[PDB]
Design a binder for this molecule. Structure first.
Ligand SMILES: CCCCCCCC/C=C\CCCCCCCC(=O)O[C@H](COC(=O)CCCCCCCCCCCCCCC)COP(=O)(O)OCCN
Ligand SMILES: CCCCCCCC/C=C\CCCCCCCC(=O)O[C@H](COC(=O)CCCCCCCCCCCCCCC)COP(=O)(O)OCCN
Ligand SMILES: CCCCCCCC/C=C\CCCCCCCC(=O)O[C@H](COC(=O)CCCCCCCCCCCCCCC)COP(=O)(O)OCCN
Ligand SMILES: CCCCCCCC/C=C\CCCCCCCC(=O)O[C@H](COC(=O)CCCCCCCCCCCCCCC)COP(=O)(O)OCCN
Ligand SMILES: CCCCCCCC/C=C\CCCCCCCC(=O)O[C@H](COC(=O)CCCCCCCCCCCCCCC)COP(=O)(O)OCCN
Ligand SMILES: CCCCCCCC/C=C\CCCCCCCC(=O)O[C@H](COC(=O)CCCCCCCCCCCCCCC)COP(=O)(O)OCCN
Ligand SMILES: CCCCCCCC/C=C\CCCCCCCC(=O)O[C@H](COC(=O)CCCCCCCCCCCCCCC)COP(=O)(O)OCCN
Ligand SMILES: *[C@@H]1O[C@H](CO)[C@@H](O[C@@H]2O[C@H](CO)[C@@H](O[C@@H]3O[C@H](CO)[C@@H](O)[C@H](O)[C@@H]3O)[C@H](O)[C@H]2NC(C)=O)[C@H](O)[C@H]1NC(C)=O
Ligand SMILES: COCC(CCO[C@H]1CC[C@@]2(C)C(=CC[C@H]3[C@@H]4C[C@@H]5O[C@]6(CC[C@@H](C)CO6)[C@@H](C)[C@@H]5[C@@]4(C)CC[C@@H]32)C1)COC
Ligand SMILES: COCC(CCO[C@H]1CC[C@@]2(C)C(=CC[C@H]3[C@@H]4C[C@@H]5O[C@]6(CC[C@@H](C)CO6)[C@@H](C)[C@@H]5[C@@]4(C)CC[C@@H]32)C1)COC
Ligand SMILES: COCC(CCO[C@H]1CC[C@@]2(C)C(=CC[C@H]3[C@@H]4C[C@@H]5O[C@]6(CC[C@@H](C)CO6)[C@@H](C)[C@@H]5[C@@]4(C)CC[C@@H]32)C1)COC
Ligand SMILES: COCC(CCO[C@H]1CC[C@@]2(C)C(=CC[C@H]3[C@@H]4C[C@@H]5O[C@]6(CC[C@@H](C)CO6)[C@@H](C)[C@@H]5[C@@]4(C)CC[C@@H]32)C1)COC
Ligand SMILES: *[C@@H]1O[C@H](CO)[C@@H](O[C@@H]2O[C@H](CO)[C@@H](O)[C@H](O)[C@H]2NC(C)=O)[C@H](O)[C@H]1NC(C)=O
Ligand SMILES: *[C@@H]1O[C@H](CO)[C@@H](O[C@@H]2O[C@H](CO)[C@@H](O)[C@H](O)[C@H]2NC(C)=O)[C@H](O)[C@H]1NC(C)=O
Ligand SMILES: *[C@@H]1O[C@H](CO)[C@@H](O)[C@H](O)[C@H]1NC(C)=O
Ligand SMILES: *[C@H]1O[C@H](CO)[C@@H](O)[C@H](O)[C@H]1NC(C)=O
Length: 1126
């Protein structure tokens, strides 16, 4: 039997039955509300498992042998789940927690598979390599959280109410804090949205109207999970701004409490926190992964007829024509839209039949004329014939979905689309089994939530979904829980974590959402990166001499730089309040006139200097000429008529003025040279994404076109009734007796391949799919009003799309950028781009500053008692003792909140005095270390300066007490304390390498972000002239706008992080009533509170693509310096 035990164990069929058993148990777990019948079934499963529990142990047939077998980690899962089932069969008390653990039986899928255990053993390796990075990011987030703790102590909590605190209640009258927190029906709701509008003391925060007073005292943050006080909450908020998830909303709320200035903080953070930390995580994961992969019916009749048709075969000569016919098929299907003319659609079906007959006849002749057995052989022609069969099925909704599948043969004449095909192959091939891990992991968490939250999801529903109904993302089902796990895999958690916490409870909801975020994102990361790696007279001459001496000299250069900077500032003063001061209005008029004159002058000078050949040889000189010609047209239209009708068309192009800056600056021009190097590598990938999105957009047209339109009667703004009030756009007309009802399509939808491309961008950017998916699935019929969830499985479209549309397209994109950039490092005269000659020098000097072989250790004082001082000092003990002292200081610095209690205030002040006393003592002992500690190590000058500064703090506090009290400066006075903790960089060597690498790569990053600043400038003035007077919508508030240049710069800043651009686009794209009405009374001549959809999409899409290219360049600079460190 023991012999029989083994000879059944190694038997393969036994393990395959095990695997199928596991999967069936899985499907029988996934159910919610399990019928009681099914209940008996689970008994059986236990038996099955337990029976092997026999075989496994019985293959050992011995005590020590069976314990050696259990000694394996994977079989521990079997032992545990089987004994759990046994004890549950024995006795129940049962709080239903025991019903959840049955999910881990899924992990047995890992150790039954020959590679799953291998892959998951591979994963834990990269996370252990991620050790130093994890330490740096937690310390960095703690530092920034202390910054934000002292900066925004309860600062978020400010709200606007009606006026209170009137007179002699003594405080209990409104018409103390009790009724004030009871007030929220008094809170000033952010118009058109569900939000209490913040405010602040500063003359920058969100300002309330008449009838409202602004006071910090508020009930709570948005749901208590945002706030910056209570350092744990600040750690959460800075976690999200490290992940940038919904970071725009916290950005808005902060800058509507505190004031716009503090945005510096955010960009600092978003330059350090999100950007840099995430990029390092990327770098280390990729490095460890590449390492791991490196470690790895008559005779003459038959003859004559075969040879006649062979003579036919002698000239196919239709392949390019057939390819054009395929492209014409795709086009013919593409000229499809919402309201198609009758005879139009008749012709379209006509051509449908045309193309079908064409390809069907072609295949019918080819398969018979070349070889039936060969067309049995080559699978390519086989799949062509498959699509033939599918066309036949259509001819003799979804019936169209296959007609597209031919475009892919282009991949043989088009190599990079073959590369996309190889990529999606590796998504199932080389690393494809890795993807199974993802599956399983999703499958685990996909259910681990519902049984923990779904029941709760099912009952406090009024807490999580305001519109009384199921929420848009619940977990009660298993589809919806797959969608939550998916969205979280898409880096968008906290906006559903607030839900999960507001239903059930903080502890477990955290433990599961942080778990899914970290775990699943690490897996998605390893997959992403595995893909990226598997993708691998004489007076004439005299005057000319004067001219060279003029223009080549530093004085003219610096003067022209001063001119161009003043012209850029001129542009910057094109705000909407020019009318507010008349003087500046003619001031800038004369300014512009001087600019035109000096620039045409220097144009002439360059002309005679180089002559037209060397002049128009330069592209930058070409650009300068184009701009100056625009200015010439402008000035002549000013002087000699011909204006005010239609160069008011060429009027705004003046905003491109700063485009002259790139030529003369040493840092912009070089990275711009780099980007023109990326156009030959981005055009092809743009075209690949163009085709590979045209497919999906056609598909969404077939399934979707027209169905999106629903919107509303002008009463509310939210989609109409499915019960109904209206089902039909031809049934709302019977109610349009009053125009209050509007049947409008959603601002971005599938009515073309154009708006299809737009909705596909908004989806695969993840910022603004909400209305897309919602009004996509909810829709049922071609013009049937969307029933609240019907056709619900159409999420499967986006999901499928999203995978490609993000994890391959973007993937492939990044791919070609690397090699190109990689190849750019080869033939370039240098090894790393983005560094000027002087910047190369500076980087080499900064690196030589990284000397690890030290100098002479220390001069002994020879003073006996100073010898004892030395004997206690230069040892490692005193250092780590001081280190624990500074860490206890750290925790002293974490505990504080706002308005804690006066006793706590005094206690913490006294503890600060205690610690600074400690540090003065250490400072005097250090200045007397031997003699020279004040200059032997910069790590000691740091301690000296922080001691003196700490002393300055206490004295400053005393001065504030005795002579005067300031308001926010007081806060800075109490602020520099964080510097103390920074010594850890002295202790920490890993962080001392990482932030050092950041310093190393700060030059190239300065250049790239400088170009970024210039582009923000161009676009911000571009909008200030173009995007003015737009209506307020959800993304475009009162403060983040385009009215001035500051607000424009703040908006375009957030959009520099590809965030919010949905919410800023939606107020632009809109056209016509109700929201947009007779254009506007504008102080400017340009009328309209409305946006221009053409140029709106142009502006925002182009900013996204450009800024995204600059940002990828930033990322690659970071990573290349990272590798050059090691
Ligand atoms: C790309 C992968 C997409 C996978 C989506 C699978 C959806 C399966 C599904 O909806 O069945 C759901 C259950 O699926 C399973 O039980 C596990 C299937 C594996 C039923 O959900 P319902 O709303 O209660 O009806
Ligand atoms: C790994 C993470 C382990 C998570 C265990 C945290 C325990 C959660 C319990 C908890 O509620 O902590 C509360 C604070 O928790 C939070 O606010 C969020 C904490 C987020 C930590 C994020 C860690 C990221 C890991 C990297 C206690 O603070 P409170 O202000 O007194 O709130 C009381 C009632 N609102
Ligand atoms: C690994 C082990 C980590 C253990 C984490 C269990 C911690 C559960 C904390 C807890 O209290 O769960 C409470 C309910 O406990 C449960 O639901 C049982 C959950 C069993 C854990 C399932 C194991 C998951 C395995 C993956 C809910 O928290 P709360 O008391 O409502 O907090 C409200 C405070 N405002
Ligand atoms: C090395 C190159 C340094 C580049 C220096 C200046 C680039 C020209 C940027 C235009 C200055 C904007 C002036 C302006 O907006 O005035 C209107 C005032 O704007 C403000 O108050 C915000 C200040 C924005 C500073 C942007 C740098
Ligand atoms: C490269 C991408 C630049 C995209 C700008 C070209 C379309 C400009 C907006 C436009 O012409 O649509 C005008 C009216 O707007 C529409 O309804 C058509 C929507 C077409 C949006 C095409 C967006 C392309 C997105 C590129 C994805 C890569 C015509
Ligand atoms: C080690 C000693 C920790 C001393 C903690 C004393 C408890 C102070 C109250 C407290 O935990 O503050 C709460 C937050 O305090 C903390 O965050 C301490 C967390 C220590 C993180 C170090 C783990 C690595 C909120 O108030
Ligand atoms: C090195 C630097 C490289 C620079 C490269 C290209 C520079 C691009 C220059 C075009 C940018 C400006 C285009 C533009 O604004 O035309 C706007 C186009 O107007 C439209 O309706 C767009 C029609 C959609 C056609 C799609 C393609 C747009 C054509 C431009 C390219 C007109 O603006 P506006 O409505 O007159 O605003 C006046 C309010 N005061
Ligand atoms: C911006 O900060 C100012 C502080 O200058 C806030 O005004 C002050 O608000 C407090 C209440 O929160 C007032 O205190 C009250 O006055 C009596 C006077 O005897 C005081 O004894 C009590 O403590 C009582 O709470 C304080 O008088 C008031 N200052 C003035 C001159 O009205 C202001 O509310 C802040 N703005 C916002 C947006 O809340
Ligand atoms: C309140 O009104 C304004 C006050 C100044 C403020 C906060 C405003 C917007 C632009 C802001 C600037 C964008 C610039 O962009 C940067 C970033 C990159 C730098 C290299 C160049 O300038 C900021 C320093 C510059 C800036 C962040 C500094 C602060 C500016 C609002
Ligand atoms: C602005 O005002 C709009 C309003 C309503 C207009 O009705 C629409 C009817 C269909 C029409 C003419 C328009 C939009 C998409 C259009 C398509 C975008 C496709 O994409 C292309 C271009 C990109 C290529 C990669 C693929 O094919 C076009 C050939 C394809 C197209 C231009 C063909 C014609 C389509 C207008 C009036
Ligand atoms: C290799 C080099 C690139 C090249 C010429 C190859 C053949 C197909 C080519 C494509 C056909 C597509 O046809 C188009 C035209 C219609 C567009 C809507 C998208 O697809 C080109 C962009 C697309 C294309 C012209 C771009 C370039 C491709 C050979
Ligand atoms: C019923 C109503 C249609 C519906 C919701 C259901 C099943 C298939 C679903 C489709 C698979 C199609 O194919 C998809 C997914 C599979 C991909 C191969 C191609 O595109 C979806 C666009 C298409 C789909 C996801 C859209 C919605 C379809 C249920
Ligand atoms: C348009 O909406 C109307 C009202 O919802 C529907 O028109 C029909 O509704 C009546 C009432 O039940 C039925 O008797 C007819 O049979 C319906 N028409 C058809 C063609 O079945 C219907 O929902 C929509 N009809 C059209 C043509 O769009
Ligand atoms: C019902 O009909 C009225 C009259 O057309 C609609 O009101 C106008 O809708 C158009 C749509 O572009 C706008 O251009 C006009 O500005 C609207 N007029 C107003 C009120 O100023 C109304 O929208 C229609 N409602 C339905 C049934 O969709
Ligand atoms: C909010 O909207 C109302 C609607 O008329 C408007 O009057 C008010 O100025 C707006 N205020 C803010 C802060 O958006
Ligand atoms: C509210 O009323 C008080 C007292 O009249 C006034 O000082 C304050 O400016 C008002 N604020 C509002 C309603 O904007």
């Amino acid at each position: 039997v023991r012999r029989a035990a083994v000879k059944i164990l190694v038997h393969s069929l036994f393990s395959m039955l095990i695997m199928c058993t596991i999967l069936t148990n899985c499907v029988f777990m996934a159910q919610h509300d399990p019928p009681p019948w099914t209940k008996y079934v689970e008994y059986t499963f236990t038996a099955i498992y337990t029976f092997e529990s026999l075989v496994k142990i019985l293959a050992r047939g011995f005590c020590l042998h069976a314990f050696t077998f259990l000694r394996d980690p994977w079989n521990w899962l079997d032992f545990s789940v089987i004994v759990m089932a046994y004890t549950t069969e024995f006795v129940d008390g049962n709080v239903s927690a025991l019903r959840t653990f049955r999910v881990l039986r899924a992990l047995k899928t890992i150790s039954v598979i020959s590679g799953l255990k291998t892959i998951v053993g591979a994963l834990i390796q990269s996370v252990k390599k991620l050790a130093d990075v994890m330490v740096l990011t937690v310390f960095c987030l703690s530092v920034f959280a202390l910054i934000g703790l002292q900066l925004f102590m309860g600062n978020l909590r400010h709200k606007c109410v009606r006026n209170f605190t009137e007179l002699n209640g003594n405080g209990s009258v409104e018409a103390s804090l009790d009724v004030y927190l009871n007030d929220p029906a008094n809170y000033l709701l952010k118009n058109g949205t569900t939000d209490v509008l913040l405010c602040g003391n500063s003359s920058d925060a969100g300002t309330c109207p008449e009838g409202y007073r602004c006071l910090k005292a508020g009930e709570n943050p948005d749901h208590g999970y945002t706030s910056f006080d209570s350092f744990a909450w600040a750690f959460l908020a800075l976690f999200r701004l490290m992940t940038q998830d919904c970071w725009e909303r916290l950005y808005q709320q902060t800058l509507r409490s505190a004031g716009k200035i503090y945005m510096i903080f955010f960009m600092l953070v978003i330059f350090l926190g999100s950007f840099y930390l995430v990029n390092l995580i990327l770098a280390v994961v990729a490095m460890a992964y590449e390492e791991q992969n490196q470690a790895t019916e008559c005779c003459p009749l038959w003859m004559s007829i075969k040879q006649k048709v062979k003579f036919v075969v002698m000239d196919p000569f239709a392949d390019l024509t057939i390819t054009m016919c395929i492209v014409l098929n795709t086009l013919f299907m593409a000229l499809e839209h919402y309201n198609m003319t009758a005879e139009f659609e008749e012709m379209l079906q006509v051509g449908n039949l045309v193309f079908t007959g064409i390809f069907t006849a072609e295949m019918t002749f080819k398969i018979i004329a070349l070889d039936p057995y060969y067309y049995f052989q080559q699978g390519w022609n086989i799949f062509d014939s498959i699509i033939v069969i599918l066309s036949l099925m259509e001819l003799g909704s979804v019936l169209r979905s296959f007609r597209l599948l031919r475009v892919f043969k282009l991949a043989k004449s088009w190599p990079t689309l073959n590369t996309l095909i190889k990529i999606i192959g590796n998504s199932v091939g080389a690393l494809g089994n890795l993807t199974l891990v993802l599956a399983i992991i999703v499958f685990i968490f996909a259910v681990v939530g519902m049984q923990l939250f779904g029941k709760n999801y099912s009952e406090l529903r009024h807490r999580i979904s305001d519109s009384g109904l199921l929420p848009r993302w619940h977990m009660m089902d298993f589809f919806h829980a797959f969608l939550i796990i998916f969205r979280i895999l898409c880096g968008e958690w906290i906006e559903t974590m607030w839900d999960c916490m507001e239903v059930s409870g903080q502890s477990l909801c955290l433990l599961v959402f942080l778990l899914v975020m970290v775990i699943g994102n690490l897996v998605v990361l390893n997959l992403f990166l595995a893909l990226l790696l598997s993708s691998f007279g004489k007076v004439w001459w005299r005057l000319r001499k004067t001219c060279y001496r003029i223009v080549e000299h530093s004085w003219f250069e610096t003067f022209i730089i001063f001119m161009i900077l003043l012209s850029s500032g001129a542009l910057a003063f094109e705000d909407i309040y020019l009318e507010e001061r008349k003087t500046i209005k003619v001031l800038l008029e004369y300014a512009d006139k001087m600019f035109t004159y000096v620039f045409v002058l220097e144009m002439l000078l360059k002309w005679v200097a180089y002559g037209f050949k060397k002049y128009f040889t330069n592209a930058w000189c070409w650009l300068d000429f184009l701009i100056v010609d625009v200015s010439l047209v402008s000035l002549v239209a000013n002087t000699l008529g011909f204006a005010e009708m239609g160069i008011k068309s060429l009027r705004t192009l003046r905003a491109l003025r700063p485009l002259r800056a790139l030529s003369r600056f040493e840092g912009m021009r070089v990275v711009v040279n780099a980007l023109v190097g990326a156009i030959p590598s981005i055009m092809n990938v743009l075209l690949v994404c163009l085709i590979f999105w045209l497919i999906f957009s056609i598909m969404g047209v077939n399934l979707f076109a027209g169905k999106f339109g629903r919107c509303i009667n002008q009463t509310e703004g939210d989609l109409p009734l499915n019960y109904t009030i209206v089902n039909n756009k031809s049934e709302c007309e019977s109610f349009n007796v009053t125009g209050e009802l509007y049947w409008t399509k959603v601002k971005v939808n599938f009515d073309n391949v154009g708006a299809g491309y737009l909705a596909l961008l908004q989806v695969a950017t993840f910022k603004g799919w909400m209305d897309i998916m919602y009004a996509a699935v909810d829709s049922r019929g071609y013009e049937e009003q969307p029933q609240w969830e019907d056709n619900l499985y159409m999420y499967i479209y986006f999901v499928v799309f999203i995978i490609f549309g993000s994890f391959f397209t973007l993937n492939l994109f990044i791919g070609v950028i690397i090699d190109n950039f990689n190849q750019q490092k080869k033939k370039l005269g240098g090894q790393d781009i983005f560094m000027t000659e002087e910047q190369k020098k500076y980087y080499n000097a900064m690196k030589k500053l990284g000397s690890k072989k030290p100098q002479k250790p220390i001069p002994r004082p020879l003073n006996k008692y100073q010898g004892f001082i030395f004997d206690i000092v230069t040892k490692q003990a005193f250092d780590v003792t001081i280190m624990f002292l500074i860490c206890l200081n750290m925790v002293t610095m974490m505990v504080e909140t706002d308005d804690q209690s006066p006793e706590k205030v005094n206690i913490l002040a006294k503890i600060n005095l205690l610690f600074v006393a400690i540090f003065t003592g250490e400072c005097i002992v250090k200045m007397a270390a031997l003699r020279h500690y004040y200059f032997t190590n910069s790590w000691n000058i740091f301690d000296f300066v922080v001691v003196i500064l700490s002393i300055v703090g206490t004295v400053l506090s005393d001065i504030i007490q005795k002579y005067f009290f300031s308001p926010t400066l007081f806060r800075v006075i109490r602020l520099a304390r964080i510097g103390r903790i920074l010594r850890l960089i002295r202790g920490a060597k890993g962080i001392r390498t990482l932030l050092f690498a950041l310093m190393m790569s700060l030059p190239a990053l300065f250049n790239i972000g400088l170009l970024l600043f210039l582009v923000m400038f161009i676009y911000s003035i571009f909008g200030m002239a173009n995007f003015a007077y737009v209506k307020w919508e959800a993304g475009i508030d009162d403060m983040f706008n385009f009215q001035t240049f500051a607000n424009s710069m703040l908006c375009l800043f957030q959009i520099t992080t590809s965030a919010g651009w949905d919410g800023l686009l939606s107020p632009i794209l809109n056209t016509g009533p109700p929201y947009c009405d007779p254009n506007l009374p504008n102080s400017n001549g340009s009328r309209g509170n409305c946006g221009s959809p053409a140029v709106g999409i142009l502006f925002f899409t182009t900013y996204i693509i450009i800024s995204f290219l600059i940002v990828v360049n930033m990322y690659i600079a970071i990573i290349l310096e990272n590798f050059s460190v090691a």
